[PDB]
Amino acid sequence: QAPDPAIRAALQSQPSGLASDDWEAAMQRIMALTTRNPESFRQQPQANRLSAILEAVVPSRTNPTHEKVLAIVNALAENKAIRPDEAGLVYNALLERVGRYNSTNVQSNLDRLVTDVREAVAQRERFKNEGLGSLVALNAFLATQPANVPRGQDDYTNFISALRLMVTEVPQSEVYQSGPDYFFQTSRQGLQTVNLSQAFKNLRGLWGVQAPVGDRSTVSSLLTPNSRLLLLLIAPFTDSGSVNRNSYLGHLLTLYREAIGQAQVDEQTFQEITSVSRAAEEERILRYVQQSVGLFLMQEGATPSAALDMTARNMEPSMYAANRPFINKLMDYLHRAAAMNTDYFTNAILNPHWLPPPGFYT
Amino acid sequence: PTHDVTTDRSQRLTLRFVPVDREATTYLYKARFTLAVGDNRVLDMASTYF
Amino acid sequence: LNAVVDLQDRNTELSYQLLLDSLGDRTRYFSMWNSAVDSYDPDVRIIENH
Amino acid sequence: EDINFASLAPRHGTRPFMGTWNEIGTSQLN
Amino acid sequence: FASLAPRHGTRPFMGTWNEIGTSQLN
Amino acid sequence: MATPSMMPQWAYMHIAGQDASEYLSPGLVQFARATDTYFSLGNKFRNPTVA
Amino acid sequence: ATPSMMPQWAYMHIAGQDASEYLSPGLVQFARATDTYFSLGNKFRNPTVA
Amino acid sequence: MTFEVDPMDEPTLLYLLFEVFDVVRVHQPHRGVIEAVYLRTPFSAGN
Amino acid sequence: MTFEVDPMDEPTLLYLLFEVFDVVRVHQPHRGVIEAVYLRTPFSAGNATT
Amino acid sequence: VDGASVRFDSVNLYATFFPMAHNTASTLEAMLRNDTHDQSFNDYLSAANMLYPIPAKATNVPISIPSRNWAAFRGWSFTRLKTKETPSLGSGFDPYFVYSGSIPYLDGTFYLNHTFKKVSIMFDSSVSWPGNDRLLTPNEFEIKRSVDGE
Amino acid sequence: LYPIPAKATNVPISIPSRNWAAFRGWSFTRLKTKETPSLGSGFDPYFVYSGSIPYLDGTFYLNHTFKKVSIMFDSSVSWPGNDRLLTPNEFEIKRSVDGE
Amino acid sequence: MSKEIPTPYMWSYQPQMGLAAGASQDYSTRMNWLSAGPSMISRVNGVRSHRNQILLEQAAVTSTPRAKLNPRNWPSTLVYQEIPGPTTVLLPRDALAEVRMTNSGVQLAGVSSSIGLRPDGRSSFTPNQAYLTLQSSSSEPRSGGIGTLQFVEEFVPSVYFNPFSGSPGLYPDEFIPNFDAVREAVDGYD
């Protein structure tokens, strides 16, 4: 949304840190009432500890004139009433006029304006989003056009009701330009698809005309490509009521609704194809491990990993299950201890008095 | 660091390549080498000098 | 498949000279690859004739 | 097993002393 | 949080937590 | 143009008090920090240093 | 990956993404870890635009 | 452009050089195969 | 396109022919009527819908 | 015409390898060959230098680049070198190069750089490149103001 | 027909952006200015020449003096392809001075 | 006021910065009906207007719905991202085994982003191998601009009906080759 001018004005005219305005927050610092850190103020040097005390006790009166006017000139830019580069000129001009004529009434009215203008910037955003201007002009155009008097059928009235729906239901770039002499309709701000809304009088002739079953190109194929664009745009915004068995325009709106419905089905299908196409008790276990590893190296002299594997597969299931985390830790330390030096490893195995050194633990 | 900063296989530190084909014209001496980087060894090309 | 392409308008001899000055100082003579920099005596260029 | 292997990072004390983001390759005579 | 360090207006001057130190011949 | 200024003269002239990073408007600090590379504004504001 | 898959500048790194974030998460960690001895910074260039 | 130098006896020559971006990108997908893509952003070809 | 031609000593001119498609459609509906529409597909002299 | 370095008895190469552990060296590569992160280097003096001759005792030397794109172009750079001390850039000999002494085109030691005036830059019939952001003179980058100049 | 000054070298040419809907290729040959009439003119008084006119009867004889043709689409990578040619990024003809 | 059968605005590519640069009705594929009768002229108009329809359908089907033609920057979501498969590495050595053998006297010769999967060249003294699984994608998705293949999908020629009809702030200014949408003013030293 459009940023609030008063907040933005205070974002460039007020001390970032503490000022006389933040008196209530200042007093909390100088008396350790802050939940964040109460002992901060106590530790300051005496020079900037007293200067903070003096200001809090006797606040210093300031001049809010420049802050108020900066709020107004910030608001004027957001409504584009002045160019952004003109902001420097206007700021100094208004300031001078207020100086030349300052007084209490003036100062108070500047204050009303500040509030008023905040609300005004809001009004504008809301209005630009609602897009109400277009509705106001669809109505002028409708008025120009002879309404309520079609010779063939009065589903043309129902068609007009669909026109107001489209302008209402398309908040984005709902525009009805007055034009030089004719009114125009569009959907996107880039105007890639526009209509000469005064040239839809071809539709005026073809109201109630029964649709030829045979061919689209016939004597009734009097629709200018400008007119068929109007039907294409309003097709998603018109529901039933213009009977399929009714006028040729009634039939085309059904075809466009399905064609648009086919396109959104096709859009989902295409993206999926493209993505796919582009693609105590423990110590007893320790004694067994020392003997089992030593015995297996005696009979075979296999690798330490193989020796440990054969040791683990010949244990009591109750012993293995109960101390399963310990065994895995015991094997890893024994494997790396043999990896460091086997001569010391043989001594450890051949020493039943051996106990894990600390560091096994942690 | 201790574990994975230097290997233990007996491998050279600074190789030396002798040209596999020479061509000494009147003013040009073209020499061709087959710089082979082996496997699991990474050579920084800044450290090469004729 | 060749991976080095040289153009007729790429003065890579001069480019290397500038690179060394920015990289280091090239005021100390590195004997390894003749880093001695051509530098006149700054008293015969502008003869300060006291 | 699916253990995850980090990097060794020569240690200045307990901390591995990784380093800052210095993957800069801009020389640009200009 | 011993703040007996020089100030910079407010927000006491500086200090990097890691800087006590080592060097040898290597 | 505020002719008077009743705040203490040792904090009004920035001999001791807040520093530039915390007494200018946050719009100016954010502006000055953005363009430090070219046309810096650092040397145009006092920074108190209190022992 | 060739200019038929991403623009020229964003492919040759004249604009778009510094090297700290377009490399693999593994390699930025690997380059960070061994930055003291086996430097890899000078290889990959990161863009700088005005 | 029209450089205007002072006259001199020796038949010298100007050494104008337009500055450019001159980068490579070497891939090395598989073992023993490399391929580099060069680029000059102005003056991409021609003397 | 650049062509790097040999330095002949007399004024000359390159003659590129950019190949294109050049078609007609001669249609004679009644007695004594000829009318045709042309098409040059890469380099057209055709006219929009006047 | 006086002595030569004809004999090149032998040349070799010398590549020094970091004795990196084979587990990390096989992790360094096999991750350094992904197309996401392929190394890229830029020439330091990235330039498209040419050489425009200046006849003996000649005024302004005019140059003209035909129509082309100027996408990433950043700045000019120019000095003048004597032709008697510049190789013909062609492969092999060039018997019209009989000076051995520094080569400014190669070594990077320029001295004639102090002889320039009025380096005027014009685009297509728009003869001011700096243009609106005028210098003290409006049209051309003047250098080495003559005896005149208030 | 574009021009090549006397004693000159490479002739550069630029085509403003347009779509090449059905483009079959290029063709080129070098014609001497003296022996070519002004294109699309009823009568040109600078055509003091009567021998064969290579322009409009197909008697070209100077296409042996080309060296290198370089094609670039809006200064992108060269059209001839990604790496279709032995030379990296251009067409090479008459590599006469020296070729390894 | 316009023809209801206008020539499409072809859109051109600036491959370098990867984004489009303007448009200008195709002056290369026009036919020359200025010597045809009232019927051939109609059939030519029909061929022309069938084209326009194909172009609109194509756009709906393929082009990404945007609020702004030719955006100055594309979000990471909308840009085709190359996502290669995870790269597996088969670690050759055994870290502990070669330490144990070397200390013996044997002289050998010949954040968490990794997976040490055991497969239970090789070496006789140990049966332990170890796979290593790595992510091979970028650390962060690339936003930037669009490439060649994606361009021909996003920017189809755009049929422009009743081209410049009031509201100069509503004209498609992306069609101008040197329009800077960010500041919304044509720039250039020229």
Got the DSSP string for A255-295? Answer: HHHHHHHHHHHHHHHHHHHHHHHH--HHHHHHHHHHHHHHH
Please choose, from the candidates L40, L55, L39, the residue with its C-alpha nearest in 3D space to the C-alpha of residue L6: L55
Between CA D19 and CA D14 the distance in angstroms is 14
Distance from chain centroid for Cα J28: 36
Whether G44 sits inside 8 A of D23 (CB atoms) is: yes
The one-letter code for the residue type at B21 is: D
The two tokens of residue L7 are 């020539």
The answer, for E9 touching chain A at a CB cutoff of 8 Å, is yes
Q: CB-hemisphere CA count at 13 Å for J124?
A: 5
Please choose, from the candidates K38, A124, A156, L48, the residue with its C-alpha nearest in 3D space to the C-alpha of residue I48: L48
**Cβ(L117)–Cβ(L130) below 8 Å:** yes
The one-letter code for the residue type at A52 is: A
**Cβ(H19)–Cβ(J76) below 8 Å:** yes
Between CA J8 and CA J11 the distance in angstroms is 8
What's the distance, Cα to Cα, between the start and end of chain D in Å? 53
Q: What is the 3-state secondary structure (H, E, C) of chain J?
A: CCCCCCCCCCCCECEECCCCCHHHHHHHCCCCCCCCCCCCCECCCCECCCCEECCCCCCCEECCCCCCCCCCCCCCCCCEEEHHHCCCCCCCCCCCCCCCCCCHHHHCCCCHHHCCEEEECCECCECCCCCCCCCCCCCCECCCCCCCCC
Whether J35 sits inside 8 A of G44 (CB atoms) is: no
K-chain CB neighbours of C1 within 8 Å are 83
| Residue K29 C-alpha, separation from nearest chain G C-alpha, in angstroms | 32
The two tokens of residue A189 are 């701000």
A126 backbone dihedrals φ, ψ, rounded to 5°: -60, -45
Between CA L7 and CA L26 the distance in angstroms is 7
**Cβ(G15)–Cβ(G49) below 8 Å:** yes
- Cα A227 to Cα A138, A211, J22, L6, L42: the distances in Å are 17, 17, 74, 15, 18
The two tokens of residue H34 are 């490399």
The two tokens of residue A286 are 């320790």
Please choose, from the candidates A81, A23, A77, A33, the residue with its C-alpha nearest in 3D space to the C-alpha of residue A54: A23
- Cα A342 to Cα A294, A312, G21, H47, L96: the distances in Å are 12, 20, 47, 71, 13
D-chain CB neighbours of L115 within 8 Å are 2-4
C-chain CB neighbours of K88 within 8 Å are 5
Between CA L186 and CA L190 the distance in angstroms is 11
**Cβ(L129)–Cβ(L90) below 8 Å:** yes
**Cβ(H4)–Cβ(J59) below 8 Å:** yes
Between CA K5 and CA K26 the distance in angstroms is 22
Say which DSSP state A220 is in.
T
K-chain CB neighbours of L28 within 8 Å are 18-21
A60 backbone dihedrals φ, ψ, rounded to 5°: -100, 120
Could you give the dihedral angle defined by the CA atoms of residues L84, L86, L90 and L95, in that order, rounded to the nearest 10 degrees? 130
Chains that touch E (3 or more CB pairs under 8 A): A, F
Residues 6 or more apart whose CB falls under 8 angstroms from that of A65 comprise: A95, A98, A99, A102, A107, A110
Residues 6 or more apart whose CB falls under 8 angstroms from that of L51 comprise: L8
E-chain CB neighbours of F19 within 8 Å are 8-11
Q: What is the 3-state secondary structure (H, E, C) of L112-144?
A: CCCCECCCCCCECCECCCEEEEECCCCCCCCCC
Strands H39-40 and H22-23: antiparallel
Between CA F18 and CA F10 the distance in angstroms is 11
Please choose, from the candidates B3, B47, H22, B7, the residue with its C-alpha nearest in 3D space to the C-alpha of residue B15: B47
The two tokens of residue A355 are 């106990």
Between CA I37 and CA L38 the distance in angstroms is 12
Between CA K74 and CA L11 the distance in angstroms is 13
The answer, for J44 touching chain G at a CB cutoff of 8 Å, is no
Residue I39 in 3-state DSSP? Answer: strand
Chain K residue at shortest CA distance from L22: K17
The two tokens of residue J43 are 């020439």
Chain L residue at shortest CA distance from B10: L109
Helix (H) or strand (E) run with residue A104 in it: helix A104-130
J-chain CB neighbours of H20 within 8 Å are 46-48, 72-74
**Cβ(L89)–Cβ(J27) below 8 Å:** yes
Between CA J37 and CA L136 the distance in angstroms is 9
Chain G, 6-45: which have a CB under 8 Å from a chain L CB?
A: 6-10, 15-17, 20-26, 28-29
- Cα C30 to Cα C21, C37, G13, L31: the distances in Å are 13, 10, 34, 72
Chain H residue at shortest CA distance from C12: H22
**Cβ(A203)–Cβ(A209) below 8 Å:** no
Between CA A151 and CA A168 the distance in angstroms is 28
G-chain CB neighbours of H37 within 8 Å are 2, 11-12
C-chain CB neighbours of J78 within 8 Å are none
Whether F24 sits inside 8 A of A54 (CB atoms) is: no
**Cβ(B26)–Cβ(J12) below 8 Å:** no
Between CA L162 and CA L170 the distance in angstroms is 13
| Residue L87 C-alpha, separation from nearest chain B C-alpha, in angstroms | 16
Chain C residue at shortest CA distance from H19: C10
The two tokens of residue H42 are 């102005």
Could you give the dihedral angle defined by the CA atoms of residues A136, A142, A144 and A145, in that order, rounded to the nearest 10 degrees? 170
Please choose, from the candidates A285, A288, A282, A291, the residue with its C-alpha nearest in 3D space to the C-alpha of residue A349: A291
| Residue G23 C-alpha, separation from nearest chain L C-alpha, in angstroms | 5
**Cβ(A299)–Cβ(A326) below 8 Å:** no
Distance from chain centroid for Cα A120: 26
- Cα A20 to Cα A60, E13, F47: the distances in Å are 7, 25, 20
**Cβ(L135)–Cβ(L86) below 8 Å:** yes
Residues 6 or more apart whose CB falls under 8 angstroms from that of J56 comprise: H8, H9, H10, H11
Between CA H13 and CA J113 the distance in angstroms is 12
| Residue J113 C-alpha, separation from nearest chain H C-alpha, in angstroms | 10
- A75 forms beta bridges with none
E13 backbone dihedrals φ, ψ, rounded to 5°: -55, -70
Chains that touch J (3 or more CB pairs under 8 A): B, C, D, G, H, K, L
Distance from chain centroid for Cα A344: 65
Residue K88 in 3-state DSSP? Answer: coil
- I23 forms beta bridges with I39
Nearest beta carbon to residue K4 from set I12, I17, I21: I12
A231 backbone dihedrals φ, ψ, rounded to 5°: -65, -40
The two tokens of residue A110 are 């500047």
For helices F26-34 and A5-13, what crossing angle results, to 10°?
Answer: 70
Please choose, from the candidates H11, A278, L179, the residue with its C-alpha nearest in 3D space to the C-alpha of residue J83: H11
The two tokens of residue J2 are 């006086």
Please choose, from the candidates A236, A241, A250, A228, the residue with its C-alpha nearest in 3D space to the C-alpha of residue A163: A236
Neighbour-count burial of A41, counting CB atoms closer than 10 A to its CB (0-12 exposed, 13-18 middle, 19+ buried): middle
Residue A304 in 3-state DSSP? Answer: helix
Between CA A194 and CA L3 the distance in angstroms is 12
Please choose, from the candidates L49, L95, L36, L66, the residue with its C-alpha nearest in 3D space to the C-alpha of residue L172: L66
Say which DSSP state A357 is in.
P
Chains that touch L (3 or more CB pairs under 8 A): A, B, D, G, I, J, K
DSSP assignment of A50-83, as one string? HHHHHHHHSPPP--THHHHHHHHHHHHHHTTSS-
Chains K and A make contact, 3+ CB pairs within 8 Å: no
Residue K50 in 3-state DSSP? Answer: coil
**Residue in the structure block whose two tokens are 């920017």:** L155
The answer, for A39 touching chain E at a CB cutoff of 8 Å, is yes
The one-letter code for the residue type at F26 is: P
**Cβ(L111)–Cβ(D6) below 8 Å:** yes
Between CA A188 and CA A197 the distance in angstroms is 16
Nearest beta carbon to residue L16 from set J30, J72, J132: J72
- Cα J84 to Cα A231, B45, H4: the distances in Å are 79, 37, 21
The answer, for I36 touching chain L at a CB cutoff of 8 Å, is yes
**Cβ(J35)–Cβ(G6) below 8 Å:** no
Chain K residue at shortest CA distance from C3: K88
The two tokens of residue J98 are 């009989």
H-chain CB neighbours of K88 within 8 Å are 38
Between CA A227 and CA L125 the distance in angstroms is 85
Say which DSSP state H26 is in.
B
Nearest beta carbon to residue K72 from set H35, H38, H45: H45
The answer, for I32 touching chain L at a CB cutoff of 8 Å, is no
